[PDB]
Amino acid sequence: MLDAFAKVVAQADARGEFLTNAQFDALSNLVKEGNKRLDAVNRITSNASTIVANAARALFAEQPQLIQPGGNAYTNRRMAACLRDMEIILRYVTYAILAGDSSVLDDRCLNGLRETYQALGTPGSSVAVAIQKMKDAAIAIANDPNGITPGDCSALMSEIAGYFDRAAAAVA
Amino acid sequence: MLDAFAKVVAQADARGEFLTNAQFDALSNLVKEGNKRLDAVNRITSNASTIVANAARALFAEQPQLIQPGGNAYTNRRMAACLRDMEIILRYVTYAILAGDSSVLDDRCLNGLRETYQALGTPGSSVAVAIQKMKDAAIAIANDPNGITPGDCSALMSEIAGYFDRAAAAVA
Amino acid sequence: MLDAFAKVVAQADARGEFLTNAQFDALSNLVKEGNKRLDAVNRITSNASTIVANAARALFAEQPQLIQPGGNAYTNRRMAACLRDMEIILRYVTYAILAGDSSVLDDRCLNGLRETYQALGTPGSSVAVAIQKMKDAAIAIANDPNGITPGDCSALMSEIAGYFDRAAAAVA
Amino acid sequence: MKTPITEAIAAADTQGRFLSNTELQAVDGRFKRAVASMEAARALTNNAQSLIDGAAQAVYQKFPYTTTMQGSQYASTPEGKAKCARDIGYYLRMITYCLVAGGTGPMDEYLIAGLSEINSTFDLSPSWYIEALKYIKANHGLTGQAAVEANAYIDYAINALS
Amino acid sequence: MKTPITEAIAAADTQGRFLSNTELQAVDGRFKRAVASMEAARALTNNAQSLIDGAAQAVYQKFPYTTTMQGSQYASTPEGKAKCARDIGYYLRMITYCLVAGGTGPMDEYLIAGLSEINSTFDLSPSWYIEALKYIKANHGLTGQAAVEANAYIDYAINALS
Amino acid sequence: MKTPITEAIAAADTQGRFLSNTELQAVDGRFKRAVASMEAARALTNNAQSLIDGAAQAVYQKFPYTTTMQGSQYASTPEGKAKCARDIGYYLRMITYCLVAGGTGPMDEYLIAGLSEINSTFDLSPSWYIEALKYIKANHGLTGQAAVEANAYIDYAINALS
Ligand SMILES: *[C@@H](C)[C@H]1/C(=C/c2[nH]c(/C=C3N=C(/C=C4\NC(=O)C(CC)=C4C)C(C)=C\3CCC(=O)O)c(CCC(=O)O)c2C)NC(=O)[C@@H]1C
Ligand SMILES: *[C@@H](C)[C@H]1/C(=C/c2[nH]c(/C=C3N=C(/C=C4\NC(=O)C(CC)=C4C)C(C)=C\3CCC(=O)O)c(CCC(=O)O)c2C)NC(=O)[C@@H]1C
Ligand SMILES: *[C@@H](C)[C@H]1/C(=C/c2[nH]c(/C=C3N=C(/C=C4\NC(=O)C(CC)=C4C)C(C)=C\3CCC(=O)O)c(CCC(=O)O)c2C)NC(=O)[C@@H]1C
Ligand SMILES: *[C@H](C)[C@H]1/C(=C/c2[nH]c(/C=C3N=C(/C=C4\NC(=O)C(CC)=C4C)C(C)=C\3CCC(=O)O)c(CCC(=O)O)c2C)NC(=O)[C@@H]1C
Ligand SMILES: *[C@H](C)[C@H]1/C(=C/c2[nH]c(/C=C3N=C(/C=C4\NC(=O)C(CC)=C4C)C(C)=C\3CCC(=O)O)c(CCC(=O)O)c2C)NC(=O)[C@@H]1C
Ligand SMILES: *[C@H](C)[C@H]1/C(=C/c2[nH]c(/C=C3N=C(/C=C4\NC(=O)C(CC)=C4C)C(C)=C\3CCC(=O)O)c(CCC(=O)O)c2C)NC(=O)[C@@H]1C
Ligand SMILES: *[C@H](C)[C@H]1/C(=C/c2[nH]c(/C=C3N=C(/C=C4\NC(=O)C(CC)=C4C)C(C)=C\3CCC(=O)O)c(CCC(=O)O)c2C)NC(=O)[C@@H]1C
Ligand SMILES: *[C@H](C)[C@H]1/C(=C/c2[nH]c(/C=C3N=C(/C=C4\NC(=O)C(CC)=C4C)C(C)=C\3CCC(=O)O)c(CCC(=O)O)c2C)NC(=O)[C@@H]1C
Ligand SMILES: *[C@H](C)[C@H]1/C(=C/c2[nH]c(/C=C3N=C(/C=C4\NC(=O)C(CC)=C4C)C(C)=C\3CCC(=O)O)c(CCC(=O)O)c2C)NC(=O)[C@@H]1C
């Protein structure tokens, strides 16, 4: 996998070129902005259970047929799996936030996920909703003004949203 | 895998419903009729060698080209494999009889067998004959009036024939 | 795998036939000619490093883009792999020479190599050149009149060329 | 799925042999038992509606707050009262499935697997469900081996919840 | 298939190395031997029809019933007499294949593998085939290393049958 | 690729857990260091042409024959002088990549892996490259933690060559 730094190095290595002044500045801004990034991971992480539980409450509220007998989330073991999937996807997202690059997420989680769910007959569309619900939950928690030093984290939140949206797309 | 009972439970679980009185009656008749089922498995089992040997004698008599040099049953090791295959298929059939459900057979034996033989260039049609010959042998042995308490096992024999025919189809 | 002898046995076994007088004569000529075969393997073997190094010098001289940054042989680890591939292919060729049959080469090396390189985005055409360059090097070394007892090895060299060409085709 | 019969076939199959006599003897064994556990099952099936309703109330009684308490996990709301009725229904249905199959297989597969995880995630306390079980155990109204077989599958469930 | 040469290549290959000198020395070794075992092979090939026929009768003699006995496994019938002629033919053909390859490889692969299973399944007693082998061993009419090489592959076969 | 951050994510991931606090603490750690190693990197990037040229000559000096000697591996020819200029360029570029990533990852992946094999195969003596490295180490013109960070990645390279 890659982090924001390695990504740029990788893009650079392949043109055989040193980093442009632009690039150096980009990474420095990332570094500068690093406390925010760290807070965001810490916060989403520390509430992972909650994010997952409440998005699942939500999804099943909106999509009851999943828990109608026969539904892809009927039976406790399928329910567990679903919840587990949601925690998995949340967990790889935190990784990507921490890295500033989607590659961990991509490679170790999104790759060939659509096909897996298709095989299983898990409705990808529904997964993608569960993902969206966590996103909105996690953004809110991450971006909570309380208990934190005031500053603008909006660019970070967009990045974060990016990874969640990216995951939702990989399975819709 | 599933047995006749689990099958019905599985069909029921997925409609989210209890068993209808019909269903209870069905399984009870199965249970009632259980000595026959047990005799059938015991008998076919106890003669497995014979069934296999004589069906193989038969098939090769009808299909000599299999044992013409070059034939898919020429050489002792291919012959052995063939015989082994026949015993395998016979063995998974007994399982299905004992369970009253084809699932063991299906899942652990028929699945993707056609494709295997195709790969190998074993003529599926010929396997399916070997299967048919064992069926007729095994029915006869199972349904022998001698050495057993008289009663009608004809419904059981049809079930049995079912599994054999099912296997023959999976490779023709 | 097969050697020249086993090949003929295999071709024979499947027609269910003994060896024709022709066949016996063929293998005897092979045996007769065996010192040459042995010299050829010994010689190519003993210079494997050289063959590989010089063909690689050559290829990259002719195809610099491979070592332009981004090129499929840029970075030392990809370069190593390439060199390794060349030694691999050379090594399976010696095997085939020693056996008088391409099967070892075929089965354990050429099989599905095109597809591998395609996956990787290694240009098969370029591999096939590297192969050709080794061929010409190895023929020269094998067929060196110095330090060896004079005799005609030209039929052997054609065989050898065969295996190299065969490998080049399997990836162009 | 795990039944006496599949367990036997599984043994033979993993050893690549035909069924043994002991295996055959086991299935016979199962058939002998099927009689009672089947009449228990259809008993439970026939006055289940009774039993379910009865069960809920009995939980409600034992744990009053479930009638009133801010919470989607609570049967305060009528939505939740449904959910709970449904959950109880699910539990009953499973003990019948077990009686029918002649083992815990169906309950193991459709209910016990993931039960911890689900109860946790959804703020569903096990006590709620253990009461409901004790209730059904009392009033299934079974006597004889039929009650034995039923109470067996029930206690199994009660364990899982503790 | 297992020959001296493939055995060598196999060693190198499983160690991922080029052929060694000892490996080369082995093949040379094989080439030195090929001469005799090849003239044995074509000897056996040239009066095989003799040898086969001769062999059958010799078995028939030793085991009279095979001429007469209800049984598809028996050369009582003329169909069976064929089968048996054929079987013997197969055995001879293999020792030649071995002589040609310079090891038991072809007989290991085309005959020995599954031999137990087949003899068993088809009520084919090994004695029948061991007699036929002793017969061929006597009258191949070979002397010298050529006979050595031949009788070697034959005894190998006789073992397998016991 | 191996950076401080990916190393952390890797630990969590192989244990299937969310990131720990110590992991977070590590990345913070990395961010604190990024400042200096980044200004080293762009320093080195800005007078690299200087440094490369300077480096080559310095090798040439130390090993005169490279200017003159039948050999494609030698910078005798002008073709080779290029190759060598290029090689040096590659080495410098990598220490910057390391400074940027905050570890040896990029040099490990783009240069160290296969370095033995390549130097061997192409008659490229390590001394050539170790001199060039000592040269750059002298004149990068860095002071402070920035020089620390740079010389660290350089020494790492020098090791690999011995
Ligand atoms: C958007 C995420 C919200 C925001 C963030 C924010 N944080 C700071 C400052 C800090 N964040 C930390 C956190 C950590 N440092 C570590 O090493 C670790 C690993 C355990 C963590 C979690 C720290 C120490 C600081 C500095 C101390 C402080 O609290 O001030 C800022 C200030 C700017 C900056 O980049 O430092 C901001 C803006 N602030 C918001 O309002 C968002 C809701
Ligand atoms: C069709 C299969 C033939 C048929 C069967 C048949 N059997 C019975 C009775 C019995 N079968 C058994 C066998 C077993 N019980 C076990 O536990 C085991 C495992 C080792 C076996 C193999 C037994 C004990 C009985 C009862 C004793 C008896 O022999 O009577 C019947 C009677 C009806 C019934 O269901 O019991 C029948 C009809 N009978 C035929 O004629 C078919 C050729
Ligand atoms: C084409 C390859 C060139 C050629 C070959 C050639 N060799 C001989 C003779 C010999 N080769 C060997 C080599 C070995 N014997 C072994 O057991 C081993 C394994 C270590 C090896 C490598 C030997 C011993 C001989 C005989 C001794 C000798 O050197 O004369 C000939 C003679 C004909 C023959 O088949 O023997 C020939 C023609 N000769 C050329 O000019 C080609 C460039
Ligand atoms: C009744 C005793 C108490 C009550 C029940 C209650 N449950 C939920 C939600 C769930 N119940 C289950 C149970 C199962 N689903 C299955 O598929 C299976 C196996 C067949 C079982 C046992 C599950 C998984 C859930 C969560 C998903 C769903 O809603 O179906 C609620 C609503 C929960 C919420 O947070 O929205 C309620 C009210 N709750 C009480 O207080 C009663 C004492
Ligand atoms: C939840 C909102 C939806 C859903 C999920 C669901 N999935 C399964 C099965 C699987 N889910 C995965 C996903 C992953 N495994 C990993 O290791 C990773 C990270 C790389 C991921 C993303 C996989 C592999 C499976 C199959 C293997 C397994 O079950 O562990 C189920 C159960 C399927 C079944 O019947 O067995 C469920 C229920 N299901 C829904 O209804 C939601 C819309
Ligand atoms: C002759 C010594 C005695 C005789 C022979 C006999 N054999 C059969 C049947 C078979 N013979 C073989 C042997 C092989 N098939 C192969 O592919 C190979 C390796 C190349 C061998 C060694 C086999 C496999 C069979 C069974 C299938 C077939 O018929 O080919 C018969 C007929 C058997 C039957 O039961 O119908 C006979 C008569 N039998 C004697 O009594 C002779 C003393
Ligand atoms: C017999 C009437 C016909 C025939 C059979 C034959 N098969 C092979 C090879 C294989 N057969 C199987 C089948 C199975 N393996 C299992 O484990 C199971 C149960 C799940 C089955 C059904 C497989 C997998 C193979 C390939 C692997 C193996 O050989 O064990 C051969 C030999 C093929 C070869 O040349 O290697 C033969 C001869 N052949 C005929 O001519 C009959 C019409
Ligand atoms: C300069 C100090 C001395 C010099 C250099 C020289 N090198 C070659 C060839 C090669 N240099 C490399 C190095 C790399 N390629 C990569 O992708 C990487 C990692 C990014 C590295 C470090 C390689 C792989 C080669 C071989 C392939 C190529 O040419 O690019 C030559 C020509 C070699 C030849 O034999 O034709 C030269 C001259 N040589 C000296 O004497 C200088 C002291
Ligand atoms: C060299 C002239 C060209 C080239 C080669 C190259 N290959 C890779 C990767 C692989 N090469 C193989 C080939 C084999 N592996 C085996 O075990 C065998 C014998 C059966 C063969 C023939 C394989 C499997 C791979 C992938 C696995 C691996 O890397 O070991 C690379 C690196 C690819 C990468 O980026 O990882 C290269 C560079 N590349 C060129 O540019 C030449 C035209």
Residue numbers in the entry:
A (entry chain B), B (entry chain B), C (entry chain B): 1 to 72, 75 to 174
D (entry chain A), E (entry chain A), F (entry chain A): 1 to 140, 143 to 150, 161 to 174
Paper's wording?
To test whether agarose could be used to deliver crystals of large, multi-protein complexes, phycocyanin (PC) was chosen as a model system.
It has low background scattering, is compatible with both soluble and membrane proteins, and can deliver the protein crystals at a wide range of temperatures down to 4°C. Using this crystal-laden agarose stream, the structure of a multi-subunit complex, phycocyanin, was solved to 2.5 Å resolution using 300 µg of microcrystals embedded into the agarose medium post-crystallization. While the growth of crystals of PC in agarose was very difficult, we succeeded in embedding pre-grown crystals into the agarose medium, which allowed a full SFX data set to be collected from PC crystals delivered in agarose. Different concentrations of agarose and glycerol were screened to optimize the extrusion conditions and 5.6% agarose dissolved in 30% glycerol was found to be the most suitable medium because it formed a stable, continuous stream and no ice-crystal diffraction artefacts were observed. A second syringe was filled with 5 µl of the highly concentrated PC crystal suspension (ideally 1011 crystals per millitre) in the crystallization mother liquor (the same mother liquor as used in the agarose preparation). The crystals were then embedded into the agarose by alternate movement of the two plungers, whereby the solutions moved back and forth between the two syringes at least 40 times, leading to the embedding of the crystals in the agarose medium at a crystal density of 2 × 1010 crystals per millitre. The time available for data collection was limited to 4 h of protein crystal screening beamtime at LCLS. A full data set for PC crystals was collected using the vacuum setup at CXI during this time as well as a brief test run on PSII crystals. In 72 min of data collection, we collected 41 100 crystal hits from PC, of which 14 143 could be indexed in a hexagonal lattice with unit-cell parameters a = b = 153.4, c = 39.6 Å.
